[PDB]
Amino acid sequence: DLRLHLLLNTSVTCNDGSPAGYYLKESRGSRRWLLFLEGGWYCFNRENCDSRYDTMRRLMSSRDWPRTRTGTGILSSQPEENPYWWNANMVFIPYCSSDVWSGASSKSEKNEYAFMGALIIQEVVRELLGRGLSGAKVLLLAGSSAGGTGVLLNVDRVAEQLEKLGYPAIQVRGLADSGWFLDNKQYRHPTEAIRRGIRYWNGVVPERCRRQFQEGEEWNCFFGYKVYPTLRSPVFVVQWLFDEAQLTVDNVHPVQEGLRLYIQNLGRELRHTLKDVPASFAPACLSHEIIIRSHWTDVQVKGTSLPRALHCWDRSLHTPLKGCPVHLVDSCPWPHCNPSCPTG
Ligand SMILES: Cc1cccc(Sc2ccc3n[nH]c(=O)n3n2)c1
DSSP states (O other): OEEEEEOSSTTSBOTTSSBOEEEEEOOTTOOEEEEEEOOOOOOOSHHHHHHHHHHOGGGTOSTTOOSEEOOOGGGOOOTTTOTTTTTSEEEEEOOOSSSTTOOOBOOOSSOSSOBOHHHHHHHHHHHHHTTTGGGOSEEEEEEETHHHHHHHHHHHHHHHHHHHHTOTTSEEEEEEESOOOOOOOOSOOOHHHHHHHHHHHTOOOOHHHHHHHOTTOGGGGGSHHHHGGGOOSOEEEEOOTEEHHHHHHTTOOOOOHHHHHHHHHHHHHHHHHTTTOSSEEEOSOEEOOOTTSTTTTSOEETTEEHHHHHHHHHHHTOOOOTTOOSEEEOOOOSTTOSTTSOOO
């Protein structure tokens, strides 16, 4: 139901120089716009990116993209599947820059690949303004996995871009799903890869965070708990307490005491980082991503689903609201101690 549009500025490109783009389903009766950033890891040097080009080429090129995609989960237009924003204008922005949405570098003499993720977002926004986004009341920049980190890295830049273009009435907000990671010690012997990636991509981080950590330390701003406090736009954080990608980088794959303590400490640490995040949804589950799967409605924390929490967040942005909470973090300490966790 979402139709592909390749960027009219064909100098804003995927890794291989093909045009980036976006999939759009308009809803003319709505002033809500949802721009979703796809995830899919990243690549950080020539050899690593060459491998990704061989077997993950859709994440590096628009040459083989389909002309349409179906909106699912928070991108669904069916109220039963999407109680939150079923009537919104839906935009899916494919991830084809392999840079966690941070890059601002073109392919050239010196560069085999272009890493333009930050510019792709800006150009999508610019071209959407002429397609109805100029009339928006809310622009929700959402994303999952690398796209969720992408939200944290880009939401304030979108807000600044719209102000500078003359649209101060559009409220820019972020929804970061499964992009809130810890730079913790591994269970058995990632920050090096991002550090290298940033130099390779000419990657950019939000200004206030950059100014805190200073030259050479911008990698810190890829970690939600460090970049989030520096952001001005409202951001809702969705994060499984035992995210499978976090456990993978931690090299966690009958559980003895050392691993039990490691897993319990990870959940405690992640819960701690969310204590001062007033709009958050963090179930005690071992899983990965939430917002674009069709059954995203099923999980609940303290009896409240994510679509409900997001609706309560909308109301809060019109004192806490009676019966309509926005801060929902499990306190139970082990995967699937929440009975509503996904099973299979
Ligand atoms: C070290 C770091 C910090 C923040 C974001 C990233 S990028 C990433 C990390 C995990 C993951 N799982 N699925 C997916 O796309 N990603 N992307 C890397």
